[PDB]
Amino acid sequence: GIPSITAYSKNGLKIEFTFERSNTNPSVTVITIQASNSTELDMTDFVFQAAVPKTFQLQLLSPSSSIVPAFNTGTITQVIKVLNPQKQQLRMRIKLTYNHKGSAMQDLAEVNNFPPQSWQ
């Protein structure tokens, strides 16, 4: 199967990606993200956004919640579907925003570690 990865891990927020290829469409890969929080305080109003190259199409489904609970007591699950009509090297930039420790947090990051099976 397609290997799962940690797409992002910083400031106590961890985002894992698991992948599933469409059986009907060689160009569709379903990514399930799981956001977890290893700190002592909740991360609230959490929003995950992503962008892919122009030849690709991206669909984001609703996240399970907007709170990444403290102490790793649960996760936020969200499904993204990537259409890769030309079977090109998968690339993605993600933007994270949330409130934590009294601050408005934001980060923008490239996902650098997609496995070949996620697009080939």
UniProtKB/Swiss-Prot annotation:
It is found in: Golgi apparatus; Cytoplasmic vesicle, Clathrin-coated vesicle membrane; Cytoplasm; Cytoplasm, Perinuclear region. Residues 1-115 form the GAE domain. Widely expressed. Belongs to the adaptor complexes large subunit family. Adaptor protein complex 1 (AP-1) is a heterotetramer composed of two large adaptins (gamma-type subunit AP1G1 and beta-type subunit AP1B1), a medium adaptin (mu-type subunit AP1M1 or AP1M2) and a small adaptin (sigma-type subunit AP1S1 or AP1S2 or AP1S3). Interacts (via GAE domain) with RABEP1. Interacts with SYNRG/gamma-synergin. Interacts with EPS15. Interacts (via GAE domain) with AP1AR (via coiled-coil domain). Interacts with CLN3 (via dileucine motif); this interaction facilitates lysosomal targeting. Subunit of clathrin-associated adaptor protein complex 1 that plays a role in protein sorting in the late-Golgi/trans-Golgi network (TGN) and/or endosomes. The AP complexes mediate both the recruitment of clathrin to membranes and the recognition of sorting signals within the cytosolic tails of transmembrane cargo molecules. It is linked to Usmani-Riazuddin syndrome, autosomal dominant: A neurodevelopmental disorder characterized by global developmental delay with impaired intellectual development and speech delay, hypotonia, and behavioral abnormalities. More variable additional features may include seizures and distal limb anomalies. Usmani-Riazuddin syndrome, autosomal recessive: A neurodevelopmental disorder characterized by global developmental delay with impaired intellectual development and speech delay, hypotonia, spasticity, and behavioral abnormalities. More variable additional features may include seizures, scoliosis, and joint laxity. This is AP-1 complex subunit gamma-1. It comes from Homo sapiens. The lineage of its organism: Eukaryota, Metazoa, Chordata, Craniata, Vertebrata. The chain holds residues 703 to 822 of 822 of the full protein.
